[PDB]
RNA sequence: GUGGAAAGGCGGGCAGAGGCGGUUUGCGUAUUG
């Protein structure tokens, strides 16, 4: 029924050990419910709201695997100026906004030719054993197609994983990331 | 009834001073002393309206406990003498209920006024209250 | 429909409590040794003070019963008082009978207009405030919390006493059995500062609306503020420190060029004396 | 049902001690200036317990003129346990008999209750006097700077008889002489009936002008002389226009039983145009 | 090249009404060192 493992207990599940869950989640999704105003008589029009809530040491992070040079060039000043202007989400009352420090982190993977995504695969050929997810974005203002990502956690055979442009109607084309994040897994008779 | 008066009260009084420090116990220890020290007060009668002036006493300084000051040494001062003025005003069959009332917190006064101030008076408000609130219990007020 | 802005006359002053004051609010939060009627207290500072709810509801309900009175005549000066009839809807249970009083709070009356458009007129409820279903008139005043003085602030620190316990009884006529108790009122002659804000939003409208609060004030200082009252308890009096205007260009820029009015030893009395038309007579050339 | 409002008359004027004052072992004095004071209730439940007691024997004579008279006997539900009966006094407050008529329309029709309020279950109906505390007077205010006693003591004693064992204690009184300034403010509500509460509260004073105000009272803790000052009466219009339109009722030089009695009907006259 | 964009949990409500610090008890009597 668990859907995270911890950085020990990840390791182990990957060589096919017994292993043990976590036993608190960090986040809470808690719904707050807002309220709309009109300006001259002060009437009240309630919508609600929902939103992941954090705890006091706890937070979110990912991972990155490549060129350092393409790291410091590229992301640590994205991180930088996306420490001011949220991760999506209604950044204008606060939500997305976080503040940024890198580290390194290291998991071993057994040298097998399957491997767990631990990003969104978008597979081009069919996976072993996937958790299927339907999402679509919007850039600027724009939605974007439904599209079939597999959800963290699946299992691929030598697969590289896509991108795919696509058009929306704006100035620039717009790539949506589906590059998969491959650790070697130990896979089971079937 | 009274009976319970006269061997209650001589099973506590052993334990009251051997223990006159008012940091003792912050464990179910003096909450449990607490209830039996207002069990041998109950078959006397033990007006409030007297002690009202000794409870503001303790509760104008509790604020000021609370980054008021950091000196109970004025107010200390106020709450021994008066206690003695308890029965060195009032005297009578109210003086023999008063006499018990006295033994517990005359040890315990001349603690706070060498004592920490944020500590060991809330070891001994806390004691306070446990005494008047069972008092309401067991029905006297 | 058309909420505009002005600026916001304040009335900065102290309230002078010249006879015990008492408001009273909930005891026994975690805590046993109470004299079990205090004047609310922040807790904070430990200190009483006067809410801006105590304040606004006496002002308020010295305001129906003036306006209950005089409702034959003030059809032509305000309407939408063509709607009511001297007295209360209580004898039969309605939410818009003829009568004024047409509000049912809980198990009381309170005069509540029900429309926008219905308290734009009222004189009470265009200064006080109102609801309804979906119309809901939203007030103009903004009465703040009083807390003490600077000077009543020291008279804590110097060890001078603020709360008295007063004993009162009560005898039968027959036997003469004494039935005591005791109340927690504020020490009498204890000064509070209070501020009450006025939002102008209309120009038309102000003149008449500043002369209400100072006809609700004026009957405070006769009645009591609070508490038990009728013997004593009340009696409260306005000490103006100073009105000033606050404009709409005061906001803006922040240029101290608001509109002072001269309050220095006037008596609420004398504000609405003939003199009216003089001391907030350089708010005409605003407008 | 409908609460109205046409002014306030207001009773100024000065309480006199002829005789030593009590109220209570210290007379209750003021915190913030020391000086003793006579207090609202003090003031407001004596003339209560003259009137209630007034007009417990007068039951045949003000039924006519007043309803929900005949809803009670002349008596006391202290023997017989009951809360509304044909007896008058029907408040057990703890222990206490007091008068309080339990509704408001038999409130609106007592003599007592609609002068001096009365609570009710789901009536409550409220006061029409409010009576403020006395201080010292600033002539007297000055005898405390300069010295001069305000109080007093008293030593009694209390004889038992066959040991002659004198048994003293004592007494803290007012000084006989020491002047207050008292405030009754009444709120004319309904113009049908304020010709009786002005005749009617100084019938409450012109008893204790007899009795006793306060303290023992029957060894010679009494005395109030009631010197009144000025009647006024403020109308609705004065709180609008703040003008000095304030109609003054001269008895500078005239006694509660003074007002009461012949001359009552031209003092008040111009406040009857007014209504 | 962001499941995004815009959105006040708030408009109206006095902890209020009723209530005497009270009732009785004479600064005195008894005898001597
Ligand atoms: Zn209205
Ligand atoms: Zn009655």
Same mark, same amino acid.
Request: with cysteine.
């Given at each position: 029924?668990?859907?995270?493992?911890?950085?020990?207990?990840?390791?182990?599940?990957?060589?096919?050990?017994?292993?043990?869950?976590?036993?608190?989640?960090?986040?809470?999704?808690?719904?707050?419910?807002?309220?709309?105003?009109?300006?001259?008589?002060?009437?009240?029009?309630?919508?609600?709201?929902?939103?992941?809530?954090?705890?006091?040491?706890?937070?979110?992070?990912?991972?990155?695997?490549?060129?350092?040079?393409?790291?410091? +060039?590229?992301?640590?000043?994205?991180?930088?100026?996306?420490?001011?202007?949220?991760?999506?989400?209604?950044?204008?009352?606060?939500? +997305?906004?976080?503040?940024?420090?890198?580290?390194?982190?290291?998991?071993?993977?057994?040298?097998?030719?399957?491997?767990?995504?631990?990003?969104?695969?978008?597979?081009?050929?069919?996976?072993?054993?996937?958790?299927?997810?339907?999402?679509?974005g919007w850039s600027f203002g724009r939605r974007k197609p439904?599209?079939?990502?597999?959800?963290?956690?699946?299992?691929?055979?030598?697969?590289?994983?896509?991108?795919?442009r696509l058009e929306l109607g704006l100035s620039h084309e717009v790539?949506?990331?589906?590059?998969?994040?491959?650790?070697?897994?130990?896979?089971?008779?079937? | 009834?009274?009976?319970?008066?006269?061997?209650? =009260?001589?099973?506590?009084?052993?334990?009251?001073?051997?223990?006159?420090?008012?940091?003792?116990?912050?464990?179910?220890?003096?909450?449990?002393?607490?209830?039996?020290?207002?069990?041998?007060?109950?078959?006397?009668?033990?007006?409030?309206? =007297?002690?009202?002036?000794?409870?503001?006493?303790?509760?104008?300084?509790?604020?000021?406990?609370?980054?008021?000051?950091? !000196?109970?040494?004025? !107010?200390?001062?106020?709450?021994?003498?008066?206690?003695?003025?308890?029965?060195?005003?009032?005297?009578?069959?109210?003086?023999?209920?008063?006499?018990?009332?006295?033994?517990?917190?005359?040890?315990?006064?001349?603690?706070?006024?060498?004592?920490?101030?944020?500590?060991?008076?809330?070891?001994?408000?806390?004691?306070? =209250?446990?005494?008047?609130?069972?008092?309401?219990?067991?029905?006297?007020? | 429909?058309?909420? *505009?802005?002005?600026?916001?006359?304040?009335?900065?002053?102290?309230?002078?409590? @010249?006879?015990?004051?008492?408001?009273?609010?909930?005891?026994?939060?975690?805590?046993?040794?109470?004299?079990?009627?205090?004047?609310?207290?922040?807790?904070?500072?430990?200190?009483?003070?006067?809410?801006? &709810?105590?304040?606004?509801?006496?002002?308020?309900?010295?305001?129906?019963?003036?306006?209950?009175?005089?409702?034959?005549?003030?059809?032509?000066?305000?309407?939408?008082?063509?709607?009511? &009839?001297?007295?209360?809807?209580?004898? %039969?249970?309605?939410?818009?009978?003829?009568?004024?009083?047409?509000?049912?709070?809980?198990?009381?009356?309170?005069?509540?207009?029900?429309?926008?458009?219905?308290?734009?007129?009222?004189?009470?409820?265009?200064?006080?405030?109102?609801?309804?279903?979906?119309?809901?008139?939203?007030?103009?005043?903004?009465?703040?919390?009083?807390?003490?003085?600077?000077?009543?602030?020291?008279?804590?620190?110097?060890?001078?006493?603020?709360?008295?316990?007063? /004993?009162?009884?009560?005898?039968? *006529? @027959?036997?003469?059995?004494?039935?005591?108790?005791?109340?927690?009122?504020?020490?009498?002659?204890?000064?509070?500062?209070?501020?009450?804000?006025?939002? @102008?939003?209309?120009?038309?409208?102000?003149?008449?609306?500043?002369?209400?609060?100072?006809?609700?004030?004026?009957?405070?200082? %006769?009645?009591?503020?609070?508490?038990?009252? &009728?013997?004593?308890?009340?009696?409260?009096?306005?000490?103006?420190?100073?009105?000033?205007?606050?404009?709409? %260009?005061?906001?803006?820029?922040?240029?101290?060029?608001?509109? @002072?009015?001269?309050?220095?030893?006037?008596? &609420?009395?004398?504000? /609405?004396?003939?003199?009216?038309?003089?001391?907030?007579?350089?708010?005409?050339?605003?407008?």
């Amino acid at each position: 029924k668990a859907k995270y493992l911890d950085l020990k207990n990840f390791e182990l599940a990957l060589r096919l050990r017994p292993f043990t869950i976590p036993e608190e989640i960090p986040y809470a999704r808690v719904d707050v419910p807002r309220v709309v105003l009109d300006r001259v008589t002060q009437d009240s029009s309630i919508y609600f709201w929902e939103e992941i809530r954090f705890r006091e040491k706890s937070g979110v992070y990912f991972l990155y695997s490549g060129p350092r040079e393409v790291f410091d +060039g590229y992301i640590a000043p994205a991180m930088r100026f996306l420490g001011d202007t949220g991760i999506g989400g209604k950044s204008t009352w606060g939500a +997305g906004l976080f503040e940024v420090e890198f580290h390194e982190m290291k998991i071993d993977a057994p040298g097998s030719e399957y491997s767990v995504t631990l990003s969104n695969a978008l597979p081009t050929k069919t996976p072993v054993l996937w958790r299927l997810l339907r999402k679509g974005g919007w850039s600027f203002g724009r939605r974007k197609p439904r599209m079939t990502f597999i959800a963290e956690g699946s299992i691929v055979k030598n697969d590289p994983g896509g991108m795919e442009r696509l058009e929306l109607g704006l100035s620039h084309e717009v790539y949506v990331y589906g590059l998969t994040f491959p650790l070697g897994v130990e896979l089971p008779e079937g | 009834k009274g009976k319970q008066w006269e061997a209650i =009260q001589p099973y506590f009084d052993n334990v009251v001073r051997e223990a006159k420090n008012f940091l003792e116990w912050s464990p179910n220890k003096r909450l449990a002393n607490a209830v039996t020290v207002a069990a041998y007060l109950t078959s006397q009668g033990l007006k409030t309206n =007297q002690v009202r002036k000794i409870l503001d006493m303790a509760r104008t300084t509790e604020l000021k406990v609370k980054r008021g000051e950091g !000196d109970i040494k004025d !107010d200390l001062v106020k709450m021994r003498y008066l206690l003695a003025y308890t029965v060195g005003k009032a005297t009578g069959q109210s003086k023999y209920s008063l006499d018990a009332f006295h033994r517990i917190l005359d040890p315990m006064l001349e603690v706070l006024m060498g004592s920490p101030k944020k500590e060991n008076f809330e070891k001994f408000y806390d004691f306070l =209250q446990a005494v008047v609130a069972y008092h309401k219990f067991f029905g006297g007020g | 429909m058309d909420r *505009r802005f002005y600026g916001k006359i304040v009335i900065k002053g102290k309230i002078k409590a @010249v006879t015990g004051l008492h408001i009273g609010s909930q005891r026994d939060i975690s805590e046993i040794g109470g004299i079990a009627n205090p004047v609310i207290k922040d807790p904070h500072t430990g200190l009483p003070y006067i809410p801006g &709810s105590s304040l606004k509801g006496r002002l308020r309900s010295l305001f129906e019963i003036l306006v209950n009175s005089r409702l034959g005549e003030w059809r032509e000066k305000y309407p939408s008082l063509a709607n009511y &009839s001297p007295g209360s809807c209580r004898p %039969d249970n309605q939410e818009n009978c003829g009568k004024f009083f047409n509000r049912k709070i809980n198990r009381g009356w309170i005069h509540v207009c029900p429309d926008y458009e219905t308290a734009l007129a009222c004189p009470v409820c265009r200064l006080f405030g109102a609801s309804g279903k979906e119309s809901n008139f939203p007030s103009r005043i903004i009465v703040r919390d009083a807390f003490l003085t600077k000077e009543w602030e020291e008279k804590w620190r110097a060890g001078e006493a603020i709360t008295e316990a007063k /004993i009162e009884v009560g005898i039968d *006529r @027959v036997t003469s059995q004494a039935n005591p108790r005791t109340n927690e009122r504020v020490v009498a002659g204890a000064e509070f500062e209070f501020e009450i804000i006025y939002n @102008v939003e209309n120009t038309t409208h102000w003149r008449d609306d500043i002369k209400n609060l100072l006809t609700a004030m004026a009957l405070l200082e %006769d009645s009591y503020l609070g508490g038990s009252g &009728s013997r004593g308890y009340g009696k409260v009096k306005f000490i103006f420190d100073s009105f000033e205007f606050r404009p709409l %260009d005061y906001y803006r820029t922040g240029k101290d060029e608001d509109i @002072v009015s001269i309050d220095a030893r006037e008596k &609420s009395v004398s504000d /609405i004396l003939s003199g009216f038309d003089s001391l907030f007579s350089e708010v005409e050339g605003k407008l």
